[PDB]
Design a protein around this ligand. Structure first.
Ligand code: HEM
Length: 154
């Protein structure tokens, strides 16, 4: 489950690229998510009326939640596995209010990796792709344990 020190440095390096525009990257992520797995959009009461992609792209709220989403994941990844404090709140809201099953967390993880590969290939080689996958996998897994405690079967 854990990542080596070098694997984390691969994650932090490609992140450094995402940092310059979190809202724009988060928008792309969510658009891949909704486009590859349309069922996830029903979870979003505000974004649900969005139809095509260009519809999703001119939504200013969508881009702000993109920022919301990657702001929080950034804080998680920069802890390099020591993210208990940061997962506490995210788990609570995604296991009670929102009810986000873990496979939708897998969807969005794939989305993230698709966006990074598309936008920053020079900073996202084979081992950084693997490292980020494990990082998000370690994220999903520790959330899932929190889900258990909270009474959610994701
Ligand atoms: C890396 C994965 C994710 C991160 C870091 C993340 C983070 C957040 C944050 C910070 C919020 C606002 C504060 C809060 O609710 O705690 C939020 C809200 C929300 N999340 Fe997530 N999220 C993730 C994945 C997902 C996925 C995959 C879905 C749905 C399939 C989802 C559904 C929602 C919804 C519906 C809200 C309410 C937002 C609103 O309507 O304003 N989340 N998420």
């Amino acid at each position: 489950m854990g990542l080596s020190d070098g694997e984390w440095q691969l994650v932090l390096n490609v992140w450094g690229k995402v940092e310059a525009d979190l809202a724009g990257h988060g928008q792309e992520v969510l658009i891949r998510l909704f486009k590859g797995h349309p069922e996830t959009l029903e979870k979003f009461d505000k974004f649900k009326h969005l139809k095509s992609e260009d519809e999703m792209k001119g939504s200013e709220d969508l881009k702000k939640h993109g920022n919301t989403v990657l702001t929080a994941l950034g804080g998680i990844l920069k802890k390099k596995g020591q993210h208990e404090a940061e997962l506490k709140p995210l788990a609570q809201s995604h296991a009670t209010k929102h009810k986000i099953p873990v496979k939708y967390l897998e969807f969005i993880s794939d989305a993230i990796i698709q966006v990074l590969q598309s936008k920053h290939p020079g900073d996202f080689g084979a081992d950084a792709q693997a490292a980020m996958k494990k990082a998000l996998e370690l994220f999903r897994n520790d959330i899932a344990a929190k889900y258990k405690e909270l009474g959610f079967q994701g």
